[PDB]
Amino acid sequence: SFSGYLKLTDNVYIKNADIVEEAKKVKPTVVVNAANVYLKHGGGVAGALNKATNNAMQVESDDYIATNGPLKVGGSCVLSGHNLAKHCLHVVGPNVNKGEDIQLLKSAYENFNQHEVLLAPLLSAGIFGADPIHSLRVCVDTVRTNVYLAVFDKNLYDKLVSSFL
Ligand SMILES: O=c1cc(Br)cc[nH]1
């Protein structure tokens, strides 16, 4: 299963790892994507996950959007995990660099509660512009299922562990 994770709470675990590499090694049941409402996987975790699937995630996502329209900020959809996981849970956290309401981050993490175990990034962190310390706090206070967080940046991982209440 998952290895080298630091236990933060009863159900939240954290590791300094590349989520693509982590997904390829573990092949978890669910890998969470840091998605946008259009499922346009251009950069960040989304761009990296999509590139690992040889663009198959984008082709599948475009068909999903053509049929269903965009997701809501705070919402999600379950699609194939391709070569990375059984499923990919595309979760839309608020993008602070788009003026989106940071209060929607709790709604975004609530999507994780529909899955017993997930490999995930910190929602709204990185290119989404939110404070990753706040995202970890919302994660631990919202997610009740087993979440294994992959934090790409070593310096951010150290700051998150060292400042964890
Ligand atoms: O290129 C990337 C970006 C993020 Br964030 C995580 C993994 N790889």
UniProtKB/Swiss-Prot annotation:
Topology of the protein relative to the lipid bilayer: Multi-pass membrane protein
Catalytic activity as recorded in UniProt: Thiol-dependent hydrolysis of ester, thioester, amide, peptide and isopeptide bonds formed by the C-terminal Gly of ubiquitin (a 76-residue protein attached to proteins as an intracellular targeting signal)
Superkingdom per UniProt: Viruses
Domain Macro: 1-165
Annotated localization: Host endoplasmic reticulum membrane
Free-text activity regulation comment from the record: Inhibited in vitro by GRL-0617.
Role this protein plays: Responsible for the cleavages located at the N-terminus of the replicase polyprotein. Participates together with nsp4 in the assembly of virally-induced cytoplasmic double-membrane vesicles necessary for viral replication. Antagonizes innate immune induction of type I interferon by blocking the phosphorylation, dimerization and subsequent nuclear translocation of host IRF3. Also prevents host NF-kappa-B signaling. In addition, PL-PRO possesses a deubiquitinating/deISGylating activity and processes both 'Lys-48'- and 'Lys-63'-linked polyubiquitin chains from cellular substrates.
The protein's assembly and partners: May form homohexamers. Interacts with N protein.
Protein name as annotated: Papain-like protease nsp3
Gene, per the UniProt record: rep
